[PDB]
Design a protein around this nucleic acid. Sequence first.
RNA 1: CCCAUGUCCAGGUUGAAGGUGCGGUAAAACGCACUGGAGGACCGAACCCACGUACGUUGAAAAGUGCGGGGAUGAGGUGUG
RNA 2: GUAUGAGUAGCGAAAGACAGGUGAGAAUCCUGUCCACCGUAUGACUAAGGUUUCCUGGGGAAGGCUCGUCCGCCCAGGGUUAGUCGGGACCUAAGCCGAGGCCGAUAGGCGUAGGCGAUGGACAACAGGUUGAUAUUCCUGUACCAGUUGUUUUUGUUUGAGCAAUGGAGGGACGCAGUAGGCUAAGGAAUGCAUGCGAUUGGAAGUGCAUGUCCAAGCAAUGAGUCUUGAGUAGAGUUAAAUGCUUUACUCUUUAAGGACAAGUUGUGACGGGGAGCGAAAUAGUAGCGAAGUUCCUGACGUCACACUGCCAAGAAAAGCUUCUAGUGAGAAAACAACUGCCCGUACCGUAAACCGACACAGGUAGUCGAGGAGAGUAUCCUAAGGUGAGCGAGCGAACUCUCGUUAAGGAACUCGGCAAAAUGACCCCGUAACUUCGGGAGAAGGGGUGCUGACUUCGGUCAGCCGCAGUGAAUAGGCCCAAGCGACUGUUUAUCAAAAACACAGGUCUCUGCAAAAUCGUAAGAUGAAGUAUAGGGGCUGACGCCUGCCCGGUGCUGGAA
RNA 3: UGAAAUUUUAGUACCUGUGAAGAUGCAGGUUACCCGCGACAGGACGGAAAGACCCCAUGGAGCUUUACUGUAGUUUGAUAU
Lengths: 44, 91, 274
Amino acid sequence: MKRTYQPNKRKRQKVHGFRKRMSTKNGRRVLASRRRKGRKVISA
Amino acid sequence: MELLDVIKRPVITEKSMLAMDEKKYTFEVDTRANKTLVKQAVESAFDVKVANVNILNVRPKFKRMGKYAGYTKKRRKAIVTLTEDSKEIQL
Amino acid sequence: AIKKYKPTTNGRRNMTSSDFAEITTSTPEKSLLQPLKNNAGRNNNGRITVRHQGGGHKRQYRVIDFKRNKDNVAAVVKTIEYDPNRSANIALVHYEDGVKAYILAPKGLEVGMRLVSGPEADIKVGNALPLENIPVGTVIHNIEMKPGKGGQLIRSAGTSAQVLGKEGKYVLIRLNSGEVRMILATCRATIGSVGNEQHELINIGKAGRSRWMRKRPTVRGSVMNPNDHPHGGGEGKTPIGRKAPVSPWGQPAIGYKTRNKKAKSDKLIVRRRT
RNA sequence: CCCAUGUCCAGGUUGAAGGUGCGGUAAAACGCACUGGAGGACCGAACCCACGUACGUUGAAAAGUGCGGGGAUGAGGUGUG
RNA sequence: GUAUGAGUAGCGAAAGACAGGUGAGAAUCCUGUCCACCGUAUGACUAAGGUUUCCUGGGGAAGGCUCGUCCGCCCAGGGUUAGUCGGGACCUAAGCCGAGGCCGAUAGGCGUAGGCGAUGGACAACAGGUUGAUAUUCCUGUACCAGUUGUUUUUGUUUGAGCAAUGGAGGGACGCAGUAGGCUAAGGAAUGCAUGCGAUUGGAAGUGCAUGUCCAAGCAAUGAGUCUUGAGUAGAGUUAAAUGCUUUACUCUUUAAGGACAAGUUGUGACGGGGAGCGAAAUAGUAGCGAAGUUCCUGACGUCACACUGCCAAGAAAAGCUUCUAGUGAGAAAACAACUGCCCGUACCGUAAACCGACACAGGUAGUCGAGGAGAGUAUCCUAAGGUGAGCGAGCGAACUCUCGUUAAGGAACUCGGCAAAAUGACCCCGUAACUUCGGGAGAAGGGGUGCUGACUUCGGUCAGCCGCAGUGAAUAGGCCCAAGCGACUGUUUAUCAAAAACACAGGUCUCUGCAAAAUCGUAAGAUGAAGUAUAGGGGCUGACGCCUGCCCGGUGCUGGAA
RNA sequence: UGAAAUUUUAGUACCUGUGAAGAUGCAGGUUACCCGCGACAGGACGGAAAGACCCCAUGGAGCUUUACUGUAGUUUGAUAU
Ligand SMILES: [K+]
Ligand SMILES: [K+]
Ligand SMILES: [K+]
Ligand SMILES: [K+]
Ligand SMILES: [K+]
Ligand SMILES: [K+]
Ligand SMILES: [K+]
Ligand SMILES: [K+]
Ligand SMILES: [K+]
Ligand SMILES: [K+]
Ligand SMILES: [K+]
Ligand SMILES: [K+]
Ligand SMILES: [K+]
Ligand SMILES: [K+]
Ligand SMILES: [K+]
Ligand SMILES: [K+]
Ligand SMILES: [K+]
Ligand SMILES: [K+]
Ligand SMILES: [K+]
Ligand SMILES: [K+]
Ligand SMILES: [K+]
Ligand SMILES: [K+]
Ligand SMILES: [K+]
Ligand SMILES: [K+]
Ligand SMILES: [K+]
Ligand SMILES: [K+]
Ligand SMILES: [K+]
Ligand SMILES: [K+]
Ligand SMILES: [K+]
Ligand SMILES: [K+]
Ligand SMILES: [K+]
Ligand SMILES: [K+]
Ligand SMILES: [K+]
Ligand SMILES: [K+]
Ligand SMILES: [K+]
Ligand SMILES: [K+]
Ligand SMILES: [K+]
Ligand SMILES: [K+]
Ligand SMILES: [Mg+2]
Ligand SMILES: [Mg+2]
Ligand SMILES: [Mg+2]
Ligand SMILES: [Mg+2]
Ligand SMILES: [Mg+2]
Ligand SMILES: [Mg+2]
Ligand SMILES: [Mg+2]
Ligand SMILES: [Mg+2]
Ligand SMILES: [Mg+2]
Ligand SMILES: [Mg+2]
Ligand SMILES: [Mg+2]
Ligand SMILES: [Mg+2]
Ligand SMILES: [Mg+2]
Ligand SMILES: [Mg+2]
Ligand SMILES: [Mg+2]
Ligand SMILES: [Mg+2]
Ligand SMILES: [Mg+2]
Ligand SMILES: [Mg+2]
Ligand SMILES: [Mg+2]
Ligand SMILES: [Mg+2]
Ligand SMILES: [Mg+2]
Ligand SMILES: [Mg+2]
Ligand SMILES: [Mg+2]
Ligand SMILES: [Mg+2]
Ligand SMILES: [Mg+2]
Ligand SMILES: [Mg+2]
Ligand SMILES: [Mg+2]
Ligand SMILES: [Mg+2]
Ligand SMILES: [Mg+2]
Ligand SMILES: [Mg+2]
Ligand SMILES: [Mg+2]
Ligand SMILES: [Mg+2]
Ligand SMILES: [Mg+2]
Ligand SMILES: [Mg+2]
Ligand SMILES: [Mg+2]
Ligand SMILES: [Mg+2]
């Protein structure tokens, strides 16, 4: 009974990290959307 | 940074007092200060000769007063061991 | 020769393999090795472009000299070695100047043979010459289509081509497929035929052996769903149920030629086969 | 599904090819012993799986448990990236 | 928001009992004693993950499925110490990014040099002690690695010691399986050694009982053993050069010699440490003290070591590293003294109440160590070290449900179906059919033996005796046979109602593909196919093996033809 | 210590009949002091799920082909280079 979420610091950052978001245009769109909505944490 | 700004304050606790008996003193230092810089600052400030310097990073500790919760500031703790034939630091 | 395993187990039953008698050593020349990763039939996009590939044993690439453009000195055949990358066996040869190299192993090659390359080289098994210097009727292999590019044609185990005649700046050749075509006279080739002729008689014997050789299972289109293959769907076993059998992408699979109809080489191909 | 790189498979059993020796022959084929240790080999823990059945079915559990069950050197299990 | 169901279901795998203590209050907290549970784990380490949950002192609002004086909860303080351990200032795999560049309505895609990137390679320290909480991190002792200054002794200063390439090289450097050997851990036995003790329940001062029965890294010496031919002459190469390295021919050597490795052992580290136990007050078993540390048996796939042997599926790279000159050079080396050596992690849980499952959840969670008797074994039962008594209980001992034991006579009459249960089960010996692809079928089937005590043995037995209902006396261990269909087989599949006759498979056949191959991803570039070349690659169908695979080309496709 | 599904309000019997044709509740008759506890499951066309079967909508989606209309690709010619 292996569940969907298997925590891993490195994988979390490499997939959802701030630098990964910046690396692509659409990731920057996500960051812009987070900033517009006012999220305290815009990236993982 | 300035040497006088490297060292922030001493640490007075049971463990620190036992360290003093062994002629080692515990100081809170600037979080960007490496043990070599700490050694230089201690020598300039206290006229003593430093035998060794150990250093740790004390993580921020979670706290909460009433409905508001946050973290205490992160700290850097340095245990400075003075050589023999060296003046003791007076506090 | 081909050694047949006794049917100790159903998997072992009917299995055959090569005794590797011709193989003289199992230590490849460290200088000529290169790393190879298994692409598993996946391109730079990461998509599967060729099916039924992946897995299997690890391999080290052996740098084979198909150019054979070192005409200065002769090369003594030190060893005959097994090569996981190709069906044919390879041969380690030392040039008298101290350059080590790998070549294909022509049928009948033996340790100690002093192969030579260049126009003046005598017509002997393993030597390399430009096609213009090879007399008609010779059996050759490791043919190259562009001068200096290196042998490309007739390199599998047991294959061989024959020189039929000369004309203009080209030479007439019958390839292993039976196709007759012209090849530029300045292109080189190696006299003889590729050894390891027995390779075609091996009986793999069990599925796990194919998996070792990096062949993943092949699923027939007739047992897929309609959205997976044109043959897919239908209740129970079904016939082809189309005008003609087709590939997963609709290309007919029986008799439908695929060679480009405006192929540049058609001017050089005299008689086709396959 | 795949790539790279690691790692795991208690303990038993069986006895392929090959080799040696002795018979046999004109030479052999061939026969018999010994050696040798093959296998998607055998039995069976861990490990992996999930065939039967009972229970559970506002469950201990949004797929399980109990008793049995299959594989267990491979087309194997599994970690990391 | 509050009812009803209802003071009902549930309170989440199992052993607790009593005495004392604390307290307003105790089945639930603490101490004690006995009992019980796990012990290839429910023990000891650790990676990830969590992120303070760790320690000390307080608290009982809420959380804890009861209670709680208690807690992984709340409040207040405190706790993580590195030149050597893991990571970085070292290397690279897959993969990723990517200066110019290629391609493309825009956005961008791809990619060279060059980098990043471990899960791999390289790399200098170990034992003990110490705190409430850290320790290869602090302390004690003794080391090693890199480097600086100085002293001294050596020797070179441009016929030039020494250093030394990003360059030439060597090396690093690797699969699976199989036993055999060496060595050490580890375990066991002992009327070996040391300490303590003499029982009260009938007996024992002895061959009685209990306990313990040893220690590094580094340095020096040695080393079971492992691997390897070594020289010379003449050449040719190694973009320049080389004394390095590669290699061709020819002589001598090749049971050797030389060379390279090597687990471990002995000594020193050790006047040290640990150690049964004894044991202080001022307040504990705590300072402190402290004996002996032998022989024999077994003995590791732990290590020598992927060493050897065999096999086919043919088993990373790079750097560190060692050499070579090229270059660079006036200072180098040895001893000794002193001194320098940065950043990140270090708490705690970690087969779980601290991680993933919304829960303090009967699930899942990589790696290491994982003892004893019987035993092949990490199986099984009971135990050691060690850990634990499961976060609702007390009664009663109705139906009914579940889990479990036994059952007269019968023995499948049940039922869709022997579903379930029962039965067989370990080892040793005897014996074993049709059929067969000659391997099998086969542990077929069907039988016999097994305990204990003497005697003798060729050490496996034999004979003799003894006991029980029963001797693998408990736990753990195949039920078997006859025949038919389907699939050759091992395998794979609908995570979560289908594990199959379905898929796959080795084999067969057809067909495409002459290489910028066909095929596929992509607008393209660029890729895979392949660093492959028709004995290869793609596609269709069939599906081991054995015997075979008949007739039709009118129709539909495909192939050819070109008037 | 302490839920849940359900729940129009309920002081919530049986038979025969009647009724949207299968009544605890309507008619006639019969039976029955008030409140519970432990049990069973005939009924409340019991609870759970705006039936999946069937039909309908000028609903949707996946799939097929010699349905219609298109189209990527492939091919052939003219033309530009
Ligand atoms: K938020
Ligand atoms: K077979
Ligand atoms: K090969
Ligand atoms: K197939
Ligand atoms: K079908
Ligand atoms: K089950
Ligand atoms: K309620
Ligand atoms: K209620
Ligand atoms: K407390
Ligand atoms: K590592
Ligand atoms: K040097
Ligand atoms: K060491
Ligand atoms: K030593
Ligand atoms: K620590
Ligand atoms: K034993
Ligand atoms: K055991
Ligand atoms: K309790
Ligand atoms: K009762
Ligand atoms: K009952
Ligand atoms: K009956
Ligand atoms: K029947
Ligand atoms: K049988
Ligand atoms: K008996
Ligand atoms: K059995
Ligand atoms: K099947
Ligand atoms: K089959
Ligand atoms: K058949
Ligand atoms: K099955
Ligand atoms: K299937
Ligand atoms: K057939
Ligand atoms: K085929
Ligand atoms: K067909
Ligand atoms: K096939
Ligand atoms: K026809
Ligand atoms: K026709
Ligand atoms: K009605
Ligand atoms: K009822
Ligand atoms: K649908
Ligand atoms: Mg530190
Ligand atoms: Mg294929
Ligand atoms: Mg199907
Ligand atoms: Mg289709
Ligand atoms: Mg069909
Ligand atoms: Mg049919
Ligand atoms: Mg097997
Ligand atoms: Mg697991
Ligand atoms: Mg098995
Ligand atoms: Mg009730
Ligand atoms: Mg409980
Ligand atoms: Mg066990
Ligand atoms: Mg605590
Ligand atoms: Mg506390
Ligand atoms: Mg409570
Ligand atoms: Mg790129
Ligand atoms: Mg601790
Ligand atoms: Mg007495
Ligand atoms: Mg040169
Ligand atoms: Mg060993
Ligand atoms: Mg710790
Ligand atoms: Mg009975
Ligand atoms: Mg019957
Ligand atoms: Mg009946
Ligand atoms: Mg049954
Ligand atoms: Mg028994
Ligand atoms: Mg089958
Ligand atoms: Mg099977
Ligand atoms: Mg299912
Ligand atoms: Mg199933
Ligand atoms: Mg079929
Ligand atoms: Mg009516
Ligand atoms: Mg009625
Ligand atoms: Mg009324
Ligand atoms: Mg209903
Ligand atoms: Mg409806």
